[PDB]
Amino acid sequence: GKRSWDTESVLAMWVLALIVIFLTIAVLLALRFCGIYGYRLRRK
């Protein structure tokens, strides 16, 4: 149909969404792992 939908764009959007999910999750796991560590010695 050559309408426009270059699945490349659709393909591209799920890659960006997944990058965001990993970092989002990464931070919470690390925030907590470091949270129980008292890591946050930094609270000046």
| DSSP assignment string, 6-29 | -HHHHHHHHHHHHHHHHHHHHHHH
Token output for 1 = 């149909």
> Alpha-carbon distance 29 to 39, whole Å?
13
Q: Are 34 and 40 in contact (CB under 8 A)?
A: yes
CA dist 25 → 11, 14, 19, 29, 32 (Å): 22, 16, 10, 6, 11
Q: For residues 20 and 14, what is the distance between their CA atoms, to the nearest angstrom?
A: 10
Distance CA(10)–CA(13), nearest Å, equals 5
Q: How far apart are CA 43 and CA 27, in angstroms?
A: 18
Residue whose token pair is 């270059």 = 6
